[PDB]
């Protein structure tokens, strides 16, 4: 369905680092927030 909910916590962290998006660790309560950051980053190309 959604390419962002299907990422593992590790893959999410790799994308946050690859795009230089400031972040703390990926945990349950931050998962949704960082999925949105990556989505917004990839929308602004």
């Amino acid at each position: 369905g959604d390419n962002y909910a299907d990422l593992s916590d590790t893959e999410l962290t790799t994308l946050l680092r690859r795009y230089n998006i400031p972040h703390g660790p990926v945990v349950g309560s931050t998962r949704r927030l960082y999925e949105k950051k990556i989505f917004e980053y990839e929308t602004q190309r």
Binding site: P22, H23, G24, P25, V27, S29, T30, R32, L33, K36
Partner: protein
């Protein structure tokens, strides 16, 4: 600075309800409790795992419980001042 801010940052928070945090109004506090952030210390925890970052914290508070700008500014400010004194 508000009275709620000063009363919160003046002493340890222990198990104070989430509404004791400056910026947490009635609806905002209800929404935080439904999402499992019923105590101020649970919101502290989120502030800490976001590494005390203002933009990440305020964006999380807005998206999770509908905080407006003034509410997220005052909650962030109150947690940062509390953590600087007590952590």
């Amino acid at each position: 600075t508000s009275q709620k801010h000063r009363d919160f940052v003046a002493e340890p928070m222990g198990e104070k309800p989430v509404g004791s945090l400056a910026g947490i109004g009635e609806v905002l506090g209800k929404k935080l409790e439904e999402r499992g952030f019923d105590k101020a210390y649970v919101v502290l925890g989120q502030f800490l795992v976001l590494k005390k970052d203002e933009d990440l914290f305020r964006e999380w508070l807005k998206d999770t419980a509908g905080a407006n700008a003034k509410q997220s500014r005052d909650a962030f400010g109150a947690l940062r001042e509390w953590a600087d004194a007590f952590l």
